[PDB]
């Protein structure tokens, strides 16, 4: 107290727990001091951030270096979360998962390096994770039976016959498979291969699926053995708990058991390149749109020098923002009015994942012919801003940008934090300095005012100069992913031939051993926990006040250390629209303060916003009521930011967009539209979980129906229909008619965040905004498959539960947790074999199962029912109740921004009242409660379903008469 108080106390030379202290610098604009230390025997790096804020999150770092496209390090990681030698109960991970007030809770594999993050607002669970993963990392017990699990094994349809034919499987085989699913990350990843084909920057380490079934135990030890030892690990901590406690336990609990080494992980330089090269691959078609020739990507890449030398690569990243970003940026003049492309390519700008940076720039969507086109209008345009550079206003924009990037605040905060520094720690670099961001805008004002042409420069030498350019052209394949099953099945047949019958007989006989792992009921009571007597039993109450003002507009004003923000959002029902223009209210929402205002034309408007504000965006939200089915809420949420000083100048902008937006650009419209379809069309894969949920509930709930209308595949299939018609006028006829019942205060209501010392001022702003506006069932059951040209699938089944307001609601909320937790959980992901896949309950009460990437169809309904049974049957313990309660908890009590407290009144008109009576509700859920509330609502014939599936074609599903498909 304070956390940078205390921390700067700390004097160089303090010998420490085996540590010394190195450097403490405090960063003031991040409001925090970070401290830095090492292990004095083997010389581990360690760094700690120290700042007040709650949520203290951990992670390390090791650097990892494959040689190959197996994906060793990333099926490494997925091992080691399974077990080691303190806590060799079988899978810690989701176990722990279970087990925590956690805030965000996984890890990733880069391209070059290996982070296990998490982050808790409990002291003491802190430490139990802390002594898990270090443990996990640095002794895992490495069984030949997890070797299979998690990475590449051979086993037949059913793990009881040896008839059966063997065929590939493993969590990572399948989410590899999905990786390059996608074609926007086919296009990354092969550049990252091409433009650095020198060394371990050119394989693929997440891993080919053509490449893993050649790793062996034997090489995936080895590689654990090499590189996982402490003189390669990387250290990083933020948040505000006692940092010599965890000094105490990581020196007594780990690196005593190791002496210094030297890790030969040093990654050389990239040889430079005398001439460009130029190649030509091919990807995956389109979902599911039309013109099989108008689906051309081609980029142009560069390479930028080492970002070692931290200052010049945020000059560059600088640079690359004022090349790419916003419809006045020069590539944008040229490209995207061009009428060539459909908006820029994949990796926009500056990318610096990898050692090396590379810029990318490039389109989707064109007709190959005109790659030569787009190259030349590339470099025309590179000389045109080499002779005359760039406006200031813009530059003064994009410093207004990162400056807001620099003050806001996040709910994962941390986790930027260590994504943002993993690289540049990792490659040596030093991690303070890129901290350093005021210092970075103070030399880069300096270096601006004193050359008007730096940038010009700049550009000249590492885009005109660099001989090491490297052009990409791109086009999909219709039969790309057939090839892929055809060389899969071929490497499969040889590897079955290859093995000898007592080594099938081992194969059936570790297949038999790993179903009955995946069997048992296994304890965890050497596992330390929590119990719901550990939860504090209130929470801190929000503040709020209701004004009433001009003269019936209740405006909420919230008093919050939000560091000179100010965060504005209002929302309008939509009780009086005709019902037959809804479909097309989302792109009213996406676009409306996209379109230009009054004097000022699409790029003015765009200069202004993004030189005064951080970021407007309309996005349309449903509130369903509280306690009734067919009662719920309908409008649309406009959101903001700015800086105090600049408030007055944005609420103006707010104004005459709200009077007098330019609805006349259709041209620029069109290509917005087409832009944004691009973007929905490509976007599928990632968020299939919740279209699935969307479509599966459209036919069961009024609230459903309005969210399927706006935000399903009903929307974005609309949208593409849209984005194909030659004329729009008739469209543009119907703009007008929203706005005319849209933007007025005829039924309107605002919400306020300010700092306290700011609200007086903001309260004539709003008024002068307010007064600146004008004053004038039935349930059925639907079974929808859409044909997906995808490898994987997705599933989703909805049951009609009941809203927030009935007691047994915390009763649902539990079940549901639990049967992800103790059914799903087990049989989907590690025996089905899909990543992901689950049970959540929305806000909404509508009780939802869902399929993320699942290799099989029938088993999972299959394995519903009997999840259903199984919750029926009550075979399940009261621990389980209590790490339910504990999960849920973890859950609701997820820390909330300074920008977002308390949003959920706002919108849903939920008082600390309720929640609290359900916080009591949830300490006090019972056992008869849960099995009551699942005979009433879980069992067959009470309710009423609902069943969707997006993915490849099922011969099964297409002979069921009682399925519909779409």
Same mark, same amino acid.
């Given at each position: 107290?304070?956390?940078?108080?205390?921390?700067?106390?700390?004097?160089?030379?303090?010998?420490?727990?085996?540590?010394?202290?190195?450097?403490?610098?405090?960063?003031?604009?991040?409001?925090?001091?970070?401290?830095?230390?090492?292990?004095?025997?083997?010389?581990?790096?360690?760094?700690?951030?120290?700042?007040?804020?709650?949520?203290?999150?951990?992670?390390?770092?090791?650097?990892?270096?494959?040689?190959?496209?197996?994906?060793?390090?990333?099926?490494?990681?997925?091992?080691?979360?399974?077990?080691?030698?303190?806590?060799?109960?079988?899978?810690?991970?989701?176990?722990?998962?279970?087990?925590?007030?956690?805030?965000?809770?996984?890890?990733?594999?880069?391209?070059?390096?290996?982070?296990?993050?998490?982050?808790?607002?409990?002291?003491?669970?802190?430490?139990?994770?802390?002594?898990?993963?270090?443990?996990?990392?640095?002794?895992?017990?490495?069984?030949?039976?997890?070797?299979?699990?998690?990475?590449?094994?051979?086993?037949?349809?059913?793990?009881?016959?040896?008839?059966?034919?063997?065929?590939?499987?493993?969590?990572?085989?399948?989410?590899?498979?999905?990786?390059?699913?996608?074609?926007?990350?086919?296009?990354?990843?092969?550049?990252?291969?091409?433009?650095?084909?020198?060394?371990?920057?050119?394989?693929?380490?997440?891993?080919?699926?053509?490449?893993?079934?050649?790793?062996?135990?034997?090489?995936?030890?080895?590689?654990?053995?090499?590189?996982?030892?402490?003189?390669?690990?990387?250290?990083?901590?933020?948040?505000?708990?006692?940092?010599?406690?965890?000094?105490?336990?990581?020196?007594?609990?780990?690196?005593?058991?190791?002496?210094?080494?030297?890790?030969?992980?040093?990654?050389?330089?990239?040889?430079?390149?005398?001439?460009?090269?130029?190649?030509?691959?091919?990807?995956?078609?389109?979902?599911?749109?039309?013109?099989?020739?108008?689906?051309?990507?081609?980029?142009?890449?560069?390479?930028?020098?080492?970002?070692?030398?931290?200052?010049?690569?945020?000059?560059?990243?600088?640079?690359?923002?004022?090349?790419?970003?916003?419809?006045?940026?020069?590539?944008?003049?040229?490209?995207?009015?061009?009428?060539?492309?459909?908006?820029?390519?994949?990796?926009?700008?500056?990318?610096?994942?990898?050692? $090396? &940076?590379?810029?990318?720039?490039?389109? #989707?969507? /064109?007709? @190959? =012919?005109?790659? %030569?086109?787009?190259?030349?209008?590339?470099?025309?345009?590179?000389?045109?801003?080499?002779?005359?550079?760039?406006?200031?206003?813009?530059?003064?924009?994009?410093?207004?940008?990162?400056?807001?990037?620099?003050?806001?605040?996040?709910?994962?905060?941390?986790?930027?934090?260590?994504?943002?520094?993993?690289?540049?720690?990792?490659?040596?670099?030093?991690?303070?300095?890129?901290?350093?961001?005021?210092?970075?805008?103070?030399?880069?004002?300096?270096?601006?005012?004193?050359?008007?042409?730096?940038?010009?420069?700049?550009?000249?030498?590492?885009?005109?100069?660099?001989?090491?350019?490297?052009?990409?052209?791109?086009?999909?394949?219709?039969?790309?992913?057939?090839?892929?099953?055809?060389?899969?099945?071929?490497?499969?047949?040889?590897?079955? $031939? &290859?093995?000898?019958?007592?080594?099938? #007989?081992? /194969?059936? @006989? =570790?297949?038999? %051993?790993?179903?009955?792992?995946?069997?048992?009921?296994?304890?965890?009571?050497?596992?330390?926990?929590?119990?719901?007597?550990?939860?504090?039993?209130?929470?801190?109450?929000?503040?709020?006040?209701?004004?009433?003002?001009?003269?019936?507009?209740?405006?909420?004003?919230?008093?919050?250390?939000?560091?000179?923000?100010?965060?504005?959002?209002?929302?309008?029902?939509?009780?009086?629209?005709?019902?037959?223009?809804?479909?097309?209210?989302?792109?009213?929402?996406?676009?409306?303060?996209?379109?230009?205002?009054?004097?000022?034309?699409?790029?003015?408007?765009?200069?202004?916003?993004?030189?005064?504000?951080?970021?407007?965006?309309?996005?349309?939200?449903?509130?369903?009521?509280?306690?009734?089915?067919?009662?719920?809420?309908?409008?649309?949420?406009?959101?903001?930011?700015?800086?105090?000083?600049?408030?007055?100048?944005?609420?103006?902008?707010?104004?005459?967009?709200?009077?007098?937006?330019?609805?006349?650009?259709?041209?620029?419209?069109?290509?917005?539209?087409?832009?944004?379809?691009?973007?929905?069309?490509?976007?599928?894969?990632?968020?299939?979980?919740?279209?699935?949920?969307?479509?599966?509930?459209?036919?069961?709930?009024?609230?459903?129906?309005?969210?399927?209308?706006?935000?399903?595949?009903?929307?974005?299939?609309?949208?593409?229909?849209?984005?194909?018609?030659?004329?729009?006028?008739?469209?543009?006829?119907?703009?007008?008619?929203?706005?005319?019942?849209?933007?007025?205060?005829?039924?309107?209501?605002?919400?306020?965040?300010?700092?306290?010392?700011?609200?007086?001022?903001?309260?004539?702003?709003?008024?002068?905004?307010?007064?600146?506006?004008?004053?004038?069932?039935?349930?059925?059951?639907?079974?929808?498959?859409?044909?997906?040209?995808?490898?994987?699938?997705?599933?989703?089944?909805?049951?009609?539960?009941?809203?927030?307001?009935?007691?047994?609601?915390?009763?649902?909320?539990?079940?549901?947790?639990?049967?992800?937790?103790?059914?799903?959980?087990?049989?989907?992901?590690?025996?089905?074999?899909?990543?992901?896949?689950?049970?959540?309950?929305?806000?909404?009460?509508?009780?939802?199962?869902?399929?993320?990437?699942?290799?099989?169809?029938?088993?999972?309904?299959?394995?519903?029912?009997?999840?259903?049974?199984?919750?029926?049957?009550?075979?399940?313990?009261?621990?389980?109740?209590?790490?339910?309660?504990?999960?849920?908890?973890?859950?609701?009590?997820?820390?909330?921004?300074?920008?977002?407290?308390?949003?959920?009144?706002?919108?849903?008109?939920?008082?600390?009242?309720?929640?609290?009576?359900?916080?009591?509700?949830?300490?006090?859920?019972?056992?008869?409660?849960?099995?009551?509330?699942?005979?009433?609502?879980?069992?067959?014939?009470?309710?009423?379903?609902?069943?969707?599936?997006?993915?490849?074609?099922?011969?099964?599903?297409?002979?069921?008469?009682?399925?519909?498909?779409?």
């Amino acid at each position: 107290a304070a956390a940078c108080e205390r921390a700067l106390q700390y004097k160089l030379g303090d010998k420490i727990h085996g540590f010394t202290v190195n450097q403490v610098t405090s960063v003031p604009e991040l409001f925090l001091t970070a401290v830095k230390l090492t292990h004095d025997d083997t010389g581990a790096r360690y760094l700690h951030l120290a700042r007040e804020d709650t949520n203290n999150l951990f992670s390390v770092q090791f650097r990892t270096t494959p040689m190959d496209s197996t994906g060793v390090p990333h099926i490494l990681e997925h091992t080691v979360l399974c077990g080691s030698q303190k806590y060799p109960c079988r899978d810690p991970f989701f176990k722990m998962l279970n087990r925590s007030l956690s805030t965000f809770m996984n890890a990733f594999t880069a391209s070059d390096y290996t982070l296990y993050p998490f982050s808790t607002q409990n002291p003491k669970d802190f430490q139990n994770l802390l002594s898990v993963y270090l443990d996990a990392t640095f002794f895992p017990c490495l069984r030949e039976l997890d070797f299979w699990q998690e990475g590449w094994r051979l086993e037949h349809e059913n793990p009881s016959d040896p008839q059966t034919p063997l065929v590939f499987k493993g969590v990572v085989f399948n989410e590899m498979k999905g990786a390059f699913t996608d074609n926007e990350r086919i296009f990354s990843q092969h550049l990252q291969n091409r433009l650095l084909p020198d060394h371990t920057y050119s394989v693929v380490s997440g891993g080919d699926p053509l490449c893993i079934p050649e790793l062996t135990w034997e090489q995936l030890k080895q590689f654990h053995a090499t590189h996982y030892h402490p003189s390669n690990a990387r250290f990083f901590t933020y948040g505000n708990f006692p940092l010599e406690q965890h000094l105490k336990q990581i020196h007594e609990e780990a690196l005593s058991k190791f002496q210094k080494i030297e890790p030969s992980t040093v990654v050389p330089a990239q040889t430079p390149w005398d001439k460009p090269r130029e190649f030509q691959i091919t990807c995956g078609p389109d979902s599911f749109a039309t013109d099989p020739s108008k689906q051309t990507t081609v980029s142009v890449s560069f390479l930028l020098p080492d970002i070692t030398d931290t200052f010049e690569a945020f000059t560059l990243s600088l640079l690359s923002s004022l090349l790419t970003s916003g419809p006045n940026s020069p590539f944008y003049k040229a490209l995207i009015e061009s009428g060539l492309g459909t908006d820029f390519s994949p990796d926009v700008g500056y990318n610096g994942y990898t050692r $090396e &940076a590379y810029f990318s720039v490039g389109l #989707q969507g /064109i007709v @190959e =012919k005109d790659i %030569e086109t787009v190259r030349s209008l590339i470099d025309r345009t590179i000389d045109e801003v080499v002779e005359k550079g760039f406006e200031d206003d813009r530059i003064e924009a994009l410093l207004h940008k990162i400056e807001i990037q620099m003050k806001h605040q996040s709910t994962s905060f941390g986790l930027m934090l260590t994504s943002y520094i993993a690289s540049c720690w990792n490659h040596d670099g030093d991690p303070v300095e890129l901290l350093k961001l005021g210092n970075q805008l103070a030399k880069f004002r300096q270096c601006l005012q004193e050359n008007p042409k730096f940038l010009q420069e700049k550009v000249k030498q590492y885009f005109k100069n660099n001989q090491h350019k490297l052009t990409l052209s791109m086009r999909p394949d219709d039969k790309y992913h057939e090839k892929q099953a055809q060389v899969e099945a071929t490497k499969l047949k040889q590897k079955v $031939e &290859a093995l000898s019958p007592g080594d099938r #007989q081992q /194969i059936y @006989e =570790k297949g038999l %051993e790993l179903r009955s792992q995946q069997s048992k009921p296994q304890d965890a009571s050497c596992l330390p926990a929590l119990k719901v007597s550990d939860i504090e039993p209130t929470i801190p109450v929000t503040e709020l006040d209701v004004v009433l003002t001009a003269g019936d507009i209740p405006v909420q004003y919230c008093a919050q250390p939000t560091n000179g923000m100010v965060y504005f959002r209002a929302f309008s029902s939509l009780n009086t629209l005709p019902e037959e223009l809804r479909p097309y209210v989302p792109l009213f929402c996406s676009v409306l303060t996209k379109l230009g205002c009054g004097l000022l034309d699409y790029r003015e408007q765009a200069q202004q916003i993004e030189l005064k504000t951080g970021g407007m965006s309309a996005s349309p939200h449903v509130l369903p009521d509280d306690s009734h089915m067919d009662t719920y809420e309908q409008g649309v949420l406009f959101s903001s930011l700015c800086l105090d000083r600049n408030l007055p100048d944005m609420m103006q902008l707010w104004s005459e967009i709200f009077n007098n937006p330019c609805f006349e650009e259709e041209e620029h419209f069109k290509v917005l539209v087409k832009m944004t379809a691009q973007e929905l069309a490509n976007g599928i894969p990632d968020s299939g979980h919740l279209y699935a949920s969307i479509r599966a509930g459209r036919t069961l709930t009024p609230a459903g129906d309005l969210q399927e209308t706006f935000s399903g595949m009903d929307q974005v299939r609309l949208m593409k229909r849209i984005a194909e018609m030659t004329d729009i006028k008739p469209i543009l006829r119907k703009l007008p008619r929203i706005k005319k019942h849209l933007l007025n205060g005829d039924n309107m209501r605002c919400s306020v965040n300010a700092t306290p010392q700011q609200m007086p001022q903001t309260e004539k702003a709003v008024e002068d905004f307010l007064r600146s506006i004008g004053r004038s069932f039935k349930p059925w059951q639907m079974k929808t498959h859409f044909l997906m040209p995808f490898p994987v699938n997705y599933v989703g089944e909805c049951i009609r539960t009941v809203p927030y307001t009935d007691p047994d609601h915390a009763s649902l909320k539990i079940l549901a947790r639990l049967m992800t937790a103790k059914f799903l959980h087990t049989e989907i992901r590690e025996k089905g074999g899909a990543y992901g896949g689950g049970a959540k309950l929305s806000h909404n009460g509508i009780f939802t199962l869902y399929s993320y990437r699942d290799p099989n169809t029938i088993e999972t309904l299959q394995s519903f029912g009997k999840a259903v049974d199984w919750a029926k049957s009550g075979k399940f313990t009261q621990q389980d109740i209590d790490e339910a309660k504990l999960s849920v908890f973890s859950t609701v009590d997820a820390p909330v921004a300074p920008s977002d407290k308390g949003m959920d009144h706002f919108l849903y008109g939920l008082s600390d009242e309720m929640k609290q009576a359900h916080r009591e509700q949830l300490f006090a859920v019972s056992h008869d409660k849960l099995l009551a509330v699942s005979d009433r609502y879980l069992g067959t014939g009470k309710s009423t379903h609902g069943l969707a599936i997006l993915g490849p074609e099922n011969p099964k599903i297409a002979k069921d008469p009682s399925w519909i498909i779409r």
